[PDB]
Scaffold this active site. Structure first.
Site, PDB file in Angstrom:
ATOM      1  N   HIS A   1       0.763  -1.216   0.000  1.00 16.87           N
ATOM      2  CA  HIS A   1       0.000   0.000   0.000  1.00 16.87           C
ATOM      3  C   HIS A   1       0.810   1.291   0.000  1.00 16.87           C
ATOM      4  O   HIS A   1       1.932   1.317   0.493  1.00 16.87           O
ATOM      5  CB  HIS A   1      -0.765   0.105   1.343  1.00 16.87           C
TER       6      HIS A   1
ATOM      7  N   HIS B   1       1.128   4.629   1.802  1.00 18.50           N
ATOM      8  CA  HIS B   1       0.781   5.293   3.067  1.00 18.50           C
ATOM      9  C   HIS B   1       0.944   6.791   2.884  1.00 18.50           C
ATOM     10  O   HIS B   1       1.643   7.248   1.968  1.00 18.50           O
ATOM     11  CB  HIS B   1       1.570   4.704   4.223  1.00 18.50           C
TER      12      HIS B   1
ATOM     13  N   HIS C   1      -3.179   4.687   5.385  1.00 20.69           N
ATOM     14  CA  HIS C   1      -3.187   4.658   3.914  1.00 20.69           C
ATOM     15  C   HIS C   1      -3.587   5.992   3.313  1.00 20.69           C
ATOM     16  O   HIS C   1      -4.364   6.738   3.907  1.00 20.69           O
ATOM     17  CB  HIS C   1      -4.218   3.599   3.468  1.00 20.69           C
TER      18      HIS C   1
ATOM     19  N   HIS D   1     -11.118   0.984   3.720  1.00 20.99           N
ATOM     20  CA  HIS D   1     -10.166   0.168   2.985  1.00 20.99           C
ATOM     21  C   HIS D   1     -10.847  -0.868   2.123  1.00 20.99           C
ATOM     22  O   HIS D   1     -11.893  -1.418   2.541  1.00 20.99           O
ATOM     23  CB  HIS D   1      -9.336  -0.572   4.123  1.00 20.99           C
TER      24      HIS D   1
ATOM     25  N   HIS E   1      -9.207   2.827  -0.413  1.00 18.42           N
ATOM     26  CA  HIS E   1      -8.363   4.006  -0.258  1.00 18.42           C
ATOM     27  C   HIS E   1      -7.604   4.155  -1.571  1.00 18.42           C
ATOM     28  O   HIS E   1      -7.324   3.170  -2.257  1.00 18.42           O
ATOM     29  CB  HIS E   1      -7.323   3.700   0.841  1.00 18.42           C
TER      30      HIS E   1
ATOM     31  N   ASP F   1      -4.689   1.712  -1.739  1.00 14.01           N
ATOM     32  CA  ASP F   1      -4.927   0.289  -1.636  1.00 14.01           C
ATOM     33  C   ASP F   1      -4.562  -0.466  -2.890  1.00 14.01           C
ATOM     34  O   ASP F   1      -5.415  -0.619  -3.751  1.00 14.01           O
ATOM     35  CB  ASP F   1      -6.411   0.065  -1.296  1.00 14.01           C
TER      36      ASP F   1
ATOM     37  N   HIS G   1       3.716  -5.214   3.746  1.00 16.03           N
ATOM     38  CA  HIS G   1       3.301  -5.680   5.058  1.00 16.03           C
ATOM     39  C   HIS G   1       3.570  -7.165   5.310  1.00 16.03           C
ATOM     40  O   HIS G   1       3.775  -7.966   4.411  1.00 16.03           O
ATOM     41  CB  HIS G   1       1.786  -5.464   5.198  1.00 16.03           C
TER      42      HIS G   1
ATOM     43  N   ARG H   1       4.674  -3.431   9.274  1.00 18.70           N
ATOM     44  CA  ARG H   1       5.311  -2.903   8.067  1.00 18.70           C
ATOM     45  C   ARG H   1       6.723  -3.452   7.950  1.00 18.70           C
ATOM     46  O   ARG H   1       7.589  -3.043   8.731  1.00 18.70           O
ATOM     47  CB  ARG H   1       5.336  -1.361   8.177  1.00 18.70           C
TER      48      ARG H   1
END
Ligand SMILES: [Cu+2]
Ligand SMILES: [Cu+2]
Ligand SMILES: [Cu+2]
Ligand SMILES: [Zn+2]
Lengths: 151, 151
Positions: A44, A46, A61, A69, A78, A81, A118, A141
């Protein structure tokens, strides 16, 4: 900008280089990530390009439209995403994504924001708990980097 | 963006955190850099936010107007030319610069570009040789980082 790049780093073995290119009216995301456990990993954009506290300071995000999400193919998602990347048995994930919400210029620009990979699979907002609606239960993360302008 | 941040890292002991804030028609640059040798060190915005080859892949000074290298108060300077930072006896440089040419938005935006701290003083284009009008003779890149959007 028409081209961007991100080098992912973290406190473990996960590393990678992600390239972004504006082609026509969309953005093409390519690259590879190594050192991952086999399987799916949430991937993603951020919000902040702040790595003062490692990947934690990248914030949530990127979500200029203030939605919940979801997965990349959903209307409710988002902007950051991008779903999951899949690592093989050797820990390598090849990235090959085309996305209609991110951009390299304007309000949806991701330049100066942070790409994160992630620990766990992203459940695409369908996990049924509050956490699914925020992060897809993707967990910690593993590596991240600030997205910069490339030649 | 009205605020940005950059974390400087390299292959040696030099590290730092630089903050940027738009104020009026200027950008205020603050922060600190540690692990430096006592004295002046060139401090510039380089063109690309590409860290694939460490600080080398950042390219030359950011120079959209195609000028020669200078100091921050010169008319003939690169947009990225922020002069020198000064480290004390303990290797600590306190950054406190106000500049009207760099920007956090629009054409001269430095978001997504790279900040670099150099090994030697920047001669501000008054070195008498050809390298002076390109780089200020500031030498090696000690540490660098991509400038990202901050909260
Ligand atoms: Cu995430
Ligand atoms: Cu420089
Ligand atoms: Cu210069
Ligand atoms: Zn999300």
């Amino acid at each position: 900008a028409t081209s961007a790049v991100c080098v992912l780093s973290g406190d473990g073995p996960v590393q990678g280089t992600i390239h972004f290119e504006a082609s026509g009216d969309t953005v093409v995301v390519t690259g590879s990530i190594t050192g991952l456990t086999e399987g799916d990993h949430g991937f993603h954009v951020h919000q902040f390009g702040d790595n003062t506290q490692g990947c934690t300071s990248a914030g949530p995000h990127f979500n200029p439209l203030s939605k919940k999400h979801g997965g990349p193919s959903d209307d409710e998602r988002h902007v950051g995403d991008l779903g999951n990347v899949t690592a093989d048995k050797n820990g390598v994930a090849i990235v090959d994504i085309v996305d209609p919400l991110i951009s390299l210029s304007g309000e949806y620009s991701i330049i100066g924001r942070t790409m994160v990979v992630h620990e766990k699979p992203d459940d695409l907002g369908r996990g049924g708990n509050e956490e699914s609606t925020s992060t897809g239960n993707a967990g910690s993360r593993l590596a991240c980097g600030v997205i910069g302008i490339a030649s």
